Amino acid sequence: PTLKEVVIVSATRTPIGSFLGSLSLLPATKLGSIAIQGAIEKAGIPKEEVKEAYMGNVLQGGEGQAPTRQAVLGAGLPISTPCTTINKVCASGMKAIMMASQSLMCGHQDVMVAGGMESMSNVPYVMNRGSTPYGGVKLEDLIVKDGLTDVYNKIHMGSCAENTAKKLNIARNEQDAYAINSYTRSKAAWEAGKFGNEVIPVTVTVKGQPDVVVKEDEEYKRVDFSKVPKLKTVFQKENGTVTAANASTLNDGAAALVLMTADAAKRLNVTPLARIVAFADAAVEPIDFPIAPVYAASMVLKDVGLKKEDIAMWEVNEAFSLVVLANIKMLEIDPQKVNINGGAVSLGHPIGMSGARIVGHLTHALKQGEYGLASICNGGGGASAMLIQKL
Amino acid sequence: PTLKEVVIVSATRTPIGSFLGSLSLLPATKLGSIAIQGAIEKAGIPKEEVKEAYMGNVLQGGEGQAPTRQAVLGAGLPISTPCTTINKVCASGMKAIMMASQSLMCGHQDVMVAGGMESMSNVPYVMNRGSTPYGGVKLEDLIVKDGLTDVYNKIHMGSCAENTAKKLNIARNEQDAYAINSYTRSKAAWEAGKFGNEVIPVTVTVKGQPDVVVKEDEEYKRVDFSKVPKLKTVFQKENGTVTAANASTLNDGAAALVLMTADAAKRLNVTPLARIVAFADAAVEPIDFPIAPVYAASMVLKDVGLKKEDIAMWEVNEAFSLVVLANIKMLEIDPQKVNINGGAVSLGHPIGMSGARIVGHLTHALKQGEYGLASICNGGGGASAMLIQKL
Amino acid sequence: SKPTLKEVVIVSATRTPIGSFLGSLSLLPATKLGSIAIQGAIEKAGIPKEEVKEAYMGNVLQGGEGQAPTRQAVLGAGLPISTPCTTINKVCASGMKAIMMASQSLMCGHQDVMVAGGMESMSNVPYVMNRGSTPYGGVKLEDLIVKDGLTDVYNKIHMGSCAENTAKKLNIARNEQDAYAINSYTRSKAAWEAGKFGNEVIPVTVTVKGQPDVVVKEDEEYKRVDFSKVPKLKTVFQKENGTVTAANASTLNDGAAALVLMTADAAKRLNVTPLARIVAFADAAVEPIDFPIAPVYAASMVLKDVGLKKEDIAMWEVNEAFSLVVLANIKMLEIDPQKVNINGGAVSLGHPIGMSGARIVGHLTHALKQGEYGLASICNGGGGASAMLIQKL
Amino acid sequence: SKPTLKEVVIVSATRTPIGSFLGSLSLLPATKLGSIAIQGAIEKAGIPKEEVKEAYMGNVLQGGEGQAPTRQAVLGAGLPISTPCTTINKVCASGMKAIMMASQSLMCGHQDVMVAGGMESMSNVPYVMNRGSTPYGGVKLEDLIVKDGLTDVYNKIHMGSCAENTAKKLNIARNEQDAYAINSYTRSKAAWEAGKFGNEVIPVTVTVKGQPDVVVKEDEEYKRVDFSKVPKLKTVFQKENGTVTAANASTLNDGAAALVLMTADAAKRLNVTPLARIVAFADAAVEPIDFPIAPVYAASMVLKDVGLKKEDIAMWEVNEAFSLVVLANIKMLEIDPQKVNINGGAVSLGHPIGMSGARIVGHLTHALKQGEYGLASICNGGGGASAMLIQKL
Numbered sequence A, B: 001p002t003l004k005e006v007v008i009v010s011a012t013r014t015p016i017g018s019f020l021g022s023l024s025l026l027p028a029t030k031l032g033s034i035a036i037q038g039a040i041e042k043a044g045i046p047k048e049e050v051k052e053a054y055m056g057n058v059l060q061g062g063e064g065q066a067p068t069r070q071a072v073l074g075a076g077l078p079i080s081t082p083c084t085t086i087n088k089v090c091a092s093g094m095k096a097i098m099m100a101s102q103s104l105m106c107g108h109q110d111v112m113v114a115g116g117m118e119s120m121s122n123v124p125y126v127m128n129r130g131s132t133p134y135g136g137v138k139l140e141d142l143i144v145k146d147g148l149t150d151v152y153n154k155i156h157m158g159s160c161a162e163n164t165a166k167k168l169n170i171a172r173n174e175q176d177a178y179a180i181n182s183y184t185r186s187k188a189a190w191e192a193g194k195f196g197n198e199v200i201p202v203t204v205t206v207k208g209q210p211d212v213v214v215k216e217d218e219e220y221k222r223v224d225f226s227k228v229p230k231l232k233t234v235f236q237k238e239n240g241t242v243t244a245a246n247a248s249t250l251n252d253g254a255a256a257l258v259l260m261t262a263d264a265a266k267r268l269n270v271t272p273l274a275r276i277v278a279f280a281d282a283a284v285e286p287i288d289f290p291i292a293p294v295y296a297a298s299m300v301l302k303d304v305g306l307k308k309e310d311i312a313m314w315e316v317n318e319a320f321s322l323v324v325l326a327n328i329k330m331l332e333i334d335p336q337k338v339n340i341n342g343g344a345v346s347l348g349h350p351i352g353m354s355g356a357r358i359v360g361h362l363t364h365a366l367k368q369g370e371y372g373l374a375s376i377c378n379g380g381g382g383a384s385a386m387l388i389q390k391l
Numbered sequence C, D: 001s002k003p004t005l006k007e008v009v010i011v012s013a014t015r016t017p018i019g020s021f022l023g024s025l026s027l028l029p030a031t032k033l034g035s036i037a038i039q040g041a042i043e044k045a046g047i048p049k050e051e052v053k054e055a056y057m058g059n060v061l062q063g064g065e066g067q068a069p070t071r072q073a074v075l076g077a078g079l080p081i082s083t084p085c086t087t088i089n090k091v092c093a094s095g096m097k098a099i100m101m102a103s104q105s106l107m108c109g110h111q112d113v114m115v116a117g118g119m120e121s122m123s124n125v126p127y128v129m130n131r132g133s134t135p136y137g138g139v140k141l142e143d144l145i146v147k148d149g150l151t152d153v154y155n156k157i158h159m160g161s162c163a164e165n166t167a168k169k170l171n172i173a174r175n176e177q178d179a180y181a182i183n184s185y186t187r188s189k190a191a192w193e194a195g196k197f198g199n200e201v202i203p204v205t206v207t208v209k210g211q212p213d214v215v216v217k218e219d220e221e222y223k224r225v226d227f228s229k230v231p232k233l234k235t236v237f238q239k240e241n242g243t244v245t246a247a248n249a250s251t252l253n254d255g256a257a258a259l260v261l262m263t264a265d266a267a268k269r270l271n272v273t274p275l276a277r278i279v280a281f282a283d284a285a286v287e288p289i290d291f292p293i294a295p296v297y298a299a300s301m302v303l304k305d306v307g308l309k310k311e312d313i314a315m316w317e318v319n320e321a322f323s324l325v326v327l328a329n330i331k332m333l334e335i336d337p338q339k340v341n342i343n344g345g346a347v348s349l350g351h352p353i354g355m356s357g358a359r360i361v362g363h364l365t366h367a368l369k370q371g372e373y374g375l376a377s378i379c380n381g382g383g384g385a386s387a388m389l390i391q392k393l
Ligand SMILES: CC(C)(COP(=O)(O)OP(=O)(O)OC[C@H]1O[C@@H](n2cnc3c(N)ncnc32)[C@H](O)[C@@H]1OP(=O)(O)O)[C@@H](O)C(=O)NCCC(=O)NCCS
Pocket: A090, A148, A157, A158, A222, A223, A224, A225, A227, A228, A231, A234, A243, A244, A245, A246, A247, A248, A249, A250, A319, A320, A349, A351, A379
């Protein structure tokens, strides 16, 4: 058998909610159902055509058994649909798409859904199993413990960012300017209707309360440019660079893509949005995760013999402003082509979801024939990257 | 390009420890490192040849960031090794091998490690984020909440098994007979030294106490045949059949396989143990998970054009004695060919690990040219199955 | 022969306003409310703080309050380090039992001046997790209010459910209970608006850095009512044939009360006008479920002991743990309803459990006319009650 | 002139053995240990259970014990539902303060027979979590033993660190404290071997499903020693210039003690022969940090009150909160160490904080010879102490 070509038929997401904000009442798996149902609807195919599903989801504790299965059944897909939940930290939503693509390439399935979901609002605290130690019991926060602490260095993701800021000489003022730019671009894009095809509204229903329709990303409005340069450097008190404003935030949301072989898209007579050209993972020293996307991006370009100049649009996940700046600095690419409609610093970062979102955004924003490259760093020193071409 | 042939070059595991037992001090990721390091040593390849790693792991809460990365780096593999943690509940360890095989088939990597890990002893309790409700709250046990409760029926896996016992008329006595058979087979296999190429010992070190060397599975010695018929049916008060003895137990362990392309095995002067022929996933109603493996196995057989008679040995994961008996009954297979050297009822069931263990067991136990078929059910109504041939 | 005892007088009785649960005083620990009340009482008494020899404070839910709650309250009020302190727990009777035991010390001539009262911050009562191995399947975090405060150990049911048992026994219906409750709110509002707590309650300023000061000057709970809703409310303690509701039961609350007690001799020596004389007191206990009726027996013992008749009592303070309790007491004692809980009680003012026994004795002190007798009684979990007779001077 | 009071006698004094932390008695709630000691005390008294009119029990760490701990102990001992109950908290002094307050009631003639004592199950003391919203990043649930039991509120340090302060000021060195500690362990063992607790201690049977009964018939702690290791230990509360260690400090423990108290008249009515007469008692307080020396002033008060001299005391029980405390007391009082804590104490027998004050009065009761005076004293957190003088009959 020859490898099959893979196309993205649809890409849909919920709005991104703020921590304890507009979507905080909905579990991750419910956000997942919403996104999955929307993508199938946008693709114009029966739910029965979806053969298997992979969802990224980093913080699975307390979500109940088989989170992806919950999302899938919750969207009314057939009970025959096998489901797998994927965890590559912040790269989860992209790696799900990559692994689904590999299955399709093998001819093992012909139509799949892949994406990611996270409700950081509902991530619980943990108490260890065993005897309570004299003097007190520690209740750890899984966001911090599983989500945001580097295992090897025993520091926050934001302190690894500081490390890169030192080595690459990326200053506080530069990171602030980038963050302000992200907020600016996100607002402009929302005001321009650039997410009309990508985002689907979520209705939040509470007994005895009026329904609340969440139609846009929450985070980008949560900013005061005037305070930005005055904020404390929260990950490094002295001579720091990373702040609450220039870092990504904690958030809730889900994204899903319908993926198909070229043959399935033709059989079903759907109009594919983009072809998946290539993808790769790179890994580096854990503290150096901010630069991992540079190597992953380089890998994909080399794989298919393209040069950085051939890329119309770059999505370099805004884990921190520092990360994007480091990537631009090492790749020497045009900043006007990078995160053009905002990103995680201003839209928020539901960690298992963001890698899917940025691929979906390229699928909508690229013009016919253009190449888009999405890359995303992950805790532990990894990154994933994907190259797509708009059809 | 055409699909690459995938071979298993090594397959190694820790002993399985009892709940709060001999390996209970080790995190799942450390057990993972031990299995991964052992599999690479047995493979006889430079560790730098391992390109990427997938590990199954169902209960990831509190294990820290990127469990697979922790296992991999802990095994001394290069920081350049991308890592992804896989959750298909009890199928995780098998699904990891399947997904890694797809990557290899695509030519995306030529050498990978795939397996599973679980430390049920160290799975924590959770408290919801937010304000404490007047009157108190029970902190949920993640083994129960995420591992063992069916979301849709709101009952234990054990109670779902009861549903199948009723439907297929598989009585308490038959289940008990199967369980005794498993314990008997496990002891006989351990006494015959059948795991000398499969299991590697674990030394547990405690400061101020002597070393403990764990060299065999702990669970299978925890049995009393005279008591088996006397136990209460713990999942169902009236007309129950499932008991603590005839159900799998809660356990700790890890397993890892080194997978390669046939070309990479050739390049590296490696003599592989087995060829991965085909694999599949099936899903049915959540409550009917015990029968999913029947459909998954039939899928693989039909794909390859083998008849059930062509299979030399079957590994049908012993989630409950009930599960294996439903499979034997529906497939109409020789029970002397099924779980020949024991299984999860008596060896234990570290849920993320077992799917990998049973494939690794086939790789060692099959004779040259023989086909082995492994299948494993999973919460949510799923199963994975895989066919291999011994080389 | 009977002992010859010193005469005991109340020289001052002061309290904080009562705050609602998680309400206006919720940021202040019980011990801090204690300090405010104690300082208040001493200032009112017009004596040096150093004259106070010893202190007893009722306090039912002491968990997480820190070491020696009463000592904290006392040292926090600027009393000398030489002041011995004891924290008293007779559940809801704690505030009165503290005064009783202080009276006994005075009677014996073991001290000549004491502070006694009660304090409670139900807002700050914590949750608990057991010491030991975490059980498979879950770990309960228990609410100490429910576990230690409100659950009868023996019947394994809420105080409110025990109350239902007495409603049943004595045919006290929902409507009567509701009428009593409305009556309580009515009296509270009237008294508050008439200025009747002018010398009883002292204001509290709550300071939050960055926020405007809040001055709490009156009881919070009595404004929290809607008469129209009262009859509609669900019966929260019993699904079938219930009578007790959130409106006709006492609420959870924060507050402290403190009395300066001295021997007749010390009041003379210190040249202070005693407010009232403490005549007698008693404790009574019955079947745990039957606590609503324990104050009946306690009041009876007190009257029998002193040789007075129920008719001789000018003013009754029967703690409004539930409207039911007051009604049960009125029924069994056959007393003039118009003489009971004249200026409201716990149903409308709130029930910081360790404080209430002290507050009601303090109220009689202020409300009685010269020469009048007041009888205060209060039930407590476990099936007990305390009662106290005083006479205005 | 001076009040004429009822004579108070101790008719019995009984206790459970003291269990170690998480040890032999760890499965029993404090209230159950209370029931056992109370039942034993009434049996040893040879009186009807119905004769006990009221009950006071010391109990420092009441969190999670359920409603009204003393009521649970009393009703759990099979005493009448008519028995009023109050739970007393003066930290480590609780057990003694209970006896004192009961004595005061008896003196006033308000009751004629009472049980008074103390109980603590440190093994079963829970952790707490604040009411409200868990902060981002997690929280440490506090250990109530540490938070309510052992931390000085004002200095924000452990009792052990407060002890270091006194060691400094009075030049009480490590070696002296260690010598005292060994002496306590020696005396405890000698007394147990000599059968010195025959009438004082009652055995408890611990019953668990599936396992065989365990009969606990002696104090667990005094065996948990290694004399050779003692001077090798590091100083747990103060690393630089410390003196107090795990060995020479009291331990965490489970236990209950109960005494039958009655008026001299009641004893005659009931035809029981009393063990001792309760002569006088007092409370003293000093700076919170200085609690180790509070018992000196409390003891002096009692002697001055009755007009006796230190030399008139045949036996001293000075609670061994720390070896430091006893030495501080011996030094300031200038008394004969051979008459102090003669049959061991809290450093070796353990310190269930709410019971010890009652245990040490009970021990005096049994060990004194006819006519001899015994003085018991006990420090408490916050800077307090209680002391009691008894005379053997
Ligand atoms: C950075 C982080 C710790 C936020 O910390 P925080 O201090 O609790 O953030 P806050 O929202 O309380 O903001 C603190 C201050 O910054 C201000 N602020 C936050 N965002 C702002 C913005 N966009 N513009 C201006 N001001 C802002 C707030 O108003 C606040 O001001 P104040 O203290 O005077 O009230 C948290 O969002 C985080 O961990 N982010 C990283 C997520 C991550 O690491 N993801 C994975 C990537 S590898």
